[PDB]
Amino acid sequence: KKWLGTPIEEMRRMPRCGIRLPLLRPSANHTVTIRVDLLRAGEVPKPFPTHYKDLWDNKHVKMPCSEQNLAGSRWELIQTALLNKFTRPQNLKDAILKYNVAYSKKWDFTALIDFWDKVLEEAEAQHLYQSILPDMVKIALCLPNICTQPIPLLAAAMNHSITMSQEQIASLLANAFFCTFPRRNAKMKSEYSSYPDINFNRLFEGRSSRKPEKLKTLFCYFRRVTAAAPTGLVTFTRQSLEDFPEWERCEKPLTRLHVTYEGTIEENGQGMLQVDFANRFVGGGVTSAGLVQEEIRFLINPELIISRLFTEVLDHNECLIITGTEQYSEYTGYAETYRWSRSHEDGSERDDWQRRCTEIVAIDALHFRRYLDQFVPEKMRRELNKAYCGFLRPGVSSENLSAVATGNWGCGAFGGDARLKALIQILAAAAAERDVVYFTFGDSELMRDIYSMHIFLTERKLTVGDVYKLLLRYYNEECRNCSTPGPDIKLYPFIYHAVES
Ligand SMILES: Cn1c(=O)c2[nH]c(NCCN3CCOCC3)nc2n(C)c1=O
C-alpha cells in the first residue's frame, strides 16, 4: 500500500476548517503595513502610511533608504550604482560593490558570473540584463514608496505578528538580492549577530552545481512579481510559549495518523499546517550553500526568505508561523539532485485577509553529536516542547485546526532518529489536539513501522503520558548506561515488549 491509516480525505484542511477571521487591524502585537479599509480581492494593496516614515533603532529593520544610512547618503549611492546599463556580469558585481566597498576582497561572485556567462544561453542572458535585472532594480529603488511603515524586529521572547503585502516583500527581496541592507554583513557584528543573513551575496559565491538551480528558482520569482504585482498579504508570527505540558501526566489520547511514502508536504499537504524542518536561524542556507527541505521551500516560496530580515534566532520555546506565502516554482530532486523545473501558478484560495491558504511553521530540531544523546529526557522534552509550540494555536478549537503535514524532522545532517522523531511529533500533535499527516519520501518500511506503532498504541488506549513514560524507560534501560554508540534494543521493539508484558 502507498499509504496507511486514516484516509487523507478525512483530515482537516484550510480554508474549509477555519473560523471566520477577525477584522484585520494593527494593535500592540500586530503590525499591519497596508490600508485595511482599501484591501480588496485582486487589487494591489495600498501602503500605510502614505508617506515614508523611518525608524533607525535597535527594535526595527534598518532600511537602506533611511536618511541615517550613511558622510554621504548610502541610499543616494545605491541609486547611482544600480541605475546603470548592465550588459556583462562584471557590471552587476561592480555596481553591488560600489556601496559595499569594505567587502570587495571578501565577497566572491563566481556563481553569478558563471550563471550569466556559462549556464544561460545568449537569449536568456539578454533577457536577464535587458528586462529582469532592470525591473528588479526599479522595484528595489521604489522601496520608500512601498515599505512606508517601519518594520519591527521579531526579537526573542516577542509574541508579535507582521502582516505585509506580497508586493512589499518583493521590493525588500530585490534589495536583498542587490545586497543593500546595512549593518547585516560583518562577520564580527554585534548588532544582528543573532539574526540570519539577509543580503544575497553568498548566493553568488563558488561553483556548486546547485547555485544555477537556486538562481533559476529565484529569477523565476523575480520575473513573475516585477511583471505583475501580486495582490495578497503574508503574515509572519513569532510565537513563544511559557506553559508547557507536564508530559508524564498528560491524559490526552493520541490523534489520527495518515502516513505515506509518496507525495510531498507542499503539494499533498495543501491547507494543512506544513512543517519547515528549520535551522534556528530561519531559512538555513537558502542564500548560501544549503539545499535540503527548508531551503527548497524558501526557494519555491521566496516570500519566506524575508523572514530572515526581521526574525531573531529561535530559542528553545519559540517558533515562526508564516501564513500566505505563494508557490512560484516547481522542482525535481532534492539536495545534490535539486533542479528548477518550471514556473508554478499557485491555485490556493485566499482567506479574508487576502492571504493564500498556506500555513508553514519553522521549528528547529536539535543537532546531535552522538546518536544516543537524543534519548536523554531533557532532549526528548525539548523536542516535544518545540513541536508543541509549533502546533499549538492558543485560542482555537481543535475542530478548527488543520492536520499537521510533516516528516522526518531533524533526521538528516542533524542526526535525529526517524522513529523517535515521528513519535515525538505524534505526541506533540496529540497534546495540541491536531491530527498528523506524515511523509516518508520513499521509505515504505518506515511508513509501515510508524503506522504499526500508532495503531498499537491507540488500540491499547495509551495516553500521551503513557507513551512519554515509555520513552523515559527506554532511555533508562537501554541508553543511560550504554557504552556503545548504538543501543542493544531499538525503540519500537522495546515499546512493544514493554506494553505487551
Ligand atoms: C521534502 N522532501 C523531498 O521532497 C524529498 N525527496 C527525496 N528523495 C531522495 C533523497 N533521500 C530520500 C530518503 O530520505 C532522505 C533523502 N527525499 C526527500 N525528503 C527527505 C524530503 O523531506
Ligand SMILES: C[As](C)(=O)[O-]
Ligand atoms: C552595510 As555595513 C558597512 O553596516 O556592513
